[model samples]
Target: PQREKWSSKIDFVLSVAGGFVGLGNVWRFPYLCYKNGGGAFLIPYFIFLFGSGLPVFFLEIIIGQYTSEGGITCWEKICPLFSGIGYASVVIVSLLNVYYIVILAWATYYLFQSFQKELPWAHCNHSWNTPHCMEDTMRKNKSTNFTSPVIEFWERNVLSLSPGIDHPGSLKWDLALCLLLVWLVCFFCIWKGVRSTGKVVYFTATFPFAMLLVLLVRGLTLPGAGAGIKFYLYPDITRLEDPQVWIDAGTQIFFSYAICLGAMTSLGSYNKYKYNSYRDCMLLGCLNSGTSFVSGFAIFSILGFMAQEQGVDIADVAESGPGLAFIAYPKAVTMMPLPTFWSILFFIMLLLLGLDSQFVEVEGQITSLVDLYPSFLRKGYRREIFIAFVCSISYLLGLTMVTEGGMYVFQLFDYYAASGVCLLWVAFFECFVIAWIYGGDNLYDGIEDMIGYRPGPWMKYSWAVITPVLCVGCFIFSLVKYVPLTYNKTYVYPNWAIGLGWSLALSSMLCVPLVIVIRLCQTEGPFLVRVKYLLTPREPNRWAVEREGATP
Candidate 1:
């Protein structure tokens, strides 16, 4: 069978944007805006977004389009030795698929809970809430340490409160059921890969945009909303002087834009050979950046109201962790009039956002599998069965997160598996492979062949210099300043488990060099010649042929 092309240009862009515009846009990006430098944070954020993000974005898409291949196999057509870089990403995506769906599973349970007569996290009267529980409406009790009703609901009720990772107490059936549902929905959405994905992308991509507008207007109208908005945008130009701020800003873009991972590469592979992806690239970049800014306004607008209602400063409730989505946002929404409506709207929107991202991971992985073994995996019903098979395994692996101690395990994967450490490593190599190994003139001309022009100075340098340099800087700094995995600022991971964490990071990083070695041993040549051969592209022809056929 020939490749499945996107139905229309709109569908292709929407599909790419859908996967990019998921949960991080709503939660982490906004919080980073506040924590780093408020409105001033945009300086570093945009610097990296343009400086690093778009270049990598361009690199992945054009390569996929030019070669008409998925992430891993495309490397075989380009430079087989560097396919290890592709495998590294595959392992990262593999780990991410497992843990990321757990987040969707959590969202699903939260969505289901929103349908109850009252928001369960409200009023501190639930059987799940303990003596430490204090509803936002309650006056500050200065004596014993107390957590908000939302925290208790998340830990005590939703998670069932396991003591530690070693004590992964029991399976939480409710979460497992949600986990199963997420996997089922995800499998079916991309069971046929791009053939089925276009329509699903149409809905999942726009639903969150609609909700963001609704929530933004509602949030800004609440009392104390200005104070929250102020904190969100109170630009501190001085913070720009700090390097850690820039790295954090840099790290945020990697996660926010969803580059470096094979998903973008796989998604980009489906682009019609003749399409002008450069224009689509600019539009998607701007849309992603805009979504992050708008979401900050919405989040902090309500966060300010949350702080005011509790008689505290805005920072008191401003969480930089996943808590902002579950503990803080849930608490904030419940304080609104007709909170049931707000809660349902919020959770449902969250579910769709996660659903878009969840399905894409499966699509990307399935694309690579089928592309790698086209003769076997491409047969009728084989792709669908492979998808179901991956989903079931991902779902089973995800069950650990639904256990009492699973949150600890979740944090470990979040920290060590696809952590910024490994991402920066992959980012560095992917660019280096294209710009240095594959050749820069070739990369630029390849894009020109597809879109009919060369990228300007900023784009060109990013591929050759900026991204690779920045990634290396960030990677080394992160390892040197490495912080051990912990949950919510407490609960340090055990020493040996931290060892387990390093092993996880190594599992992905090792693939890069490991594949290079394999390429060496398998080739028929003396040592130095083998090195030269491995570094060169198997298909180094210029992009003239594809451009001619694409022309009318």
Candidate 2:
């Protein structure tokens, strides 16, 4: 067995602390706060984080550490009939990584745009305008040389995102180049599996803190920052009554934790055996939310300044939709002092934040490949080369999302990937498998053995009762919520697209239960061969340890 490596326990926790605190926490959570009634968003967000988020987290960790195997594969080891679930998670992670890299590329493109002195979108004088930015006369004033002052001025001014266009366009060539670069970097980080990934996390995880702190200090001191703060954190509890708030909070929790998509389980499995994981689990969950809570003030403070500059309400400047980063923040940065420097720093920070976590997500499935088949990997002709080659293929597949039409592709992937309907089913299945079929005691025994501390009655009660109930309730609620409620902009979805999305999610679950049933049938029938030997863990006893085993 490899001697598990982490620079330190603090480093691993901090890395995890950094990993979950990514794009979703920074961009989505604040906007949700605004959408759900300013200060009102916290109640539901935190409540669901406890109910849905943390439970799944602890489940994944217990399963990962207990089996010392990757997800889905780990499940297969416990019950060969459920091998399909593990394979499905691999697909989920792959589909997610495809679109995720596109967003990272956008962050990279914006980081380049942030270095401009004039802030390109701050003005309304370029070709991007209709009558709102400028009229026909203004459009006619530019020379066609492509290098004229007018062209340069327009490039620096007109193309900046304002009200109408969702966000500033990253030119086809630039976006393609940036996307290629991002995929390469993601590949490089996880090329040798955990060894390379661990080293990369040292920088990817820590560097963002420096950038975030810089921005936070600058943001808090700005004019109207208090108003932004009030809008973000000042709870308006009445909104908590809405079912949608609960739903959105659940989405945020799922998205933020990267649970059910194989990332957390992979991360948890890498820790040294003696480490105190429960403490890290609790801390990582808190830090994930903490970054968002802290960043809210910082984000609102800056937007508050933008509100003052644009002579508009902060609500007008604030947008929660997809354009939060590409369109909204670009305009905000342009309105600020030292537009270039702040923009550069902001994008750099965003990229680093995305980088640390992206590697983890991609490596989750890749590492499983090696863990499930170590004989081929250990003392190979060269394991690193094989990993690099596999990574290059993934990078190429990811490049499709970076094309001129990539934004559309990204939207489609986002619609079908881990974010939407798929996660709910995944969550429900995960809990059902662990809490019911496997029994929570299996997990309880394993964790107690590892940590030397047993979960109290309260935790046991929550896991056996509250956790499963929430999953079932959410599953049923999700089904009812999607039933034909309304039409038009308020309840918009073509029946075809909705059908397709559900297909992608359900197909994965279908594979799992079918395989389990088939295996059960095979075992009872004459056709059953030695399938158990193939599916079950070869070294099942390795997972067996005395009850005395505890943290050192």
Candidate 3:
């Protein structure tokens, strides 16, 4: 219940890294590397990090460091009208952690399955047989074209990949138990608050490297891994100029860097004011980009083996949706000398990878609550209870997504809301309001004053000019690209899905401006405060420095 903080400086760095190196690092990047013009993907990825990721992160850290606030509160400190942007991000990140753990549960399941000599899918004991034992499992599981002992086993124990909301009747009870267990585990981890979570990070932050080392070693030994490596790293120069690649690179950078989520802002604000946040920002950004490259090597090496095993191109082995991670990789692992070991190792690694990010995300939401309500709650309000409160509600809401029907919901939220495209647009809007309405000059001076380095004309141009144009242009292009009939699979959104997405996005994006307008119109209490903070140059608060200096 005591107010606990990060144990050390490295702890904060590890926690931040854990949050950024999440599902995007694992679920999407490897396949994208193989599919999207191979090594060419990195080109866009790098450009976007510098273009959008690094700058936005720097902007956020500056704001948080200057104000000692995060999410809704960060915006409130900046200007009351902009507070909603912070709150919206809290909702987004909290929602993300809820459903994401379900994936971690799946990884745990597969990890357990991998301990066996041959997993259900890795054998032809079923009547159907094809590319290998693994092929038979895929055929049976997909489309229900075949029914075998293995399929039955999978249905009864591990979750069915079937496209329904609730767990399939085949083994519904098992899934229910798994869901309960997962919720409980996450609950306890955060239950004690950061004290427990801080210790947990020792495992959560560092264990993935252990698992990755195993996979990496095994991967290179595979006969055709070199071929996979070639396909992965051999840059297709032509793809560099492609617009989609640029957009996606931007998207991945956003994903990989954990920008606009307010996770970093929350974490960074916890430190002593004089901490070199800009240096940390640069370090975090570099580590995030650097790890993706390392992960590429690890992922593609395995893909190379898959290509060899399938006797198909590495590109073909790369697929998307639930199938890619759940079906594709397990099969590849099972083909190894110890199928079960690799599977267990891989999934456990995933489990550890997810834990740190989950805590930081939920912790951000918790911090927001504390920031907004510190007067009432007093100090040491029982972090474990807060953890349970946030995680429990989130987990329960996630039940809607656990079923097969939930999968569609997941996919919809994932591509639309989960991607935080709408949030980015909102952030872009905030930047515009700050630059044009609030005065970019003041904000620039504030950042330079804190970081002690002038960002100069480039930042001035970006904050004042380039970023808004880029944001508006990108939003328009996204609308056109995603609208139905724009192009094949460009906007393959359902009517209601599109409607829901728009509603959520618009409500969130407009909330800040609408509130400001209303407050201005009403001419009520604190209108002056709102406008002043927005327009004012944020400087180091004197009281904060004195308090920090007093710390022994």
lDDT of each: 0.77, 0.62, 0.61
Clashes of 2: 7
> Which is superior by TM-score, 1 or 2?
1
Candidate 3 lDDT score relative to the true structure: 0.61
TM-score of 2: 0.80
lDDT order of candidates, best first? 1, 2, 3
For model 1, the local distance difference test gives 0.77
Best by TM-score: 1
Q: Candidate 2 — what's its lDDT?
A: 0.62
lDDT, candidate 2, 1-552, per-residue tens: 752556677666765665577887776676656555566777767876777688788777766666666766677655565666676677777777766777777777767755655655555445543433431123334322222222222223322222211232454567667877887787666663444545466666667776667667777877768777877777766676566565556667888888877767767766665667887788778878888778777777876765554445666654444444454455445545787877787788888778777777777777766666777774565567766766667667666555433343344455456664566667766776666656666557667777778866544545567656655665667566554321111334446545655665666656667776676676753444545443443332153332333211
Q: What is the TM-score of each candidate against the true structure?
A: 0.92, 0.80, 0.81
| Candidate structures ordered by TM-score, highest first | 1, 3, 2
lDDT of 3 by residue, 199-218 (tens): 46566666787676666676
| Per-prediction CA RMSD (Å) | 3.0, 6.5, 5.3
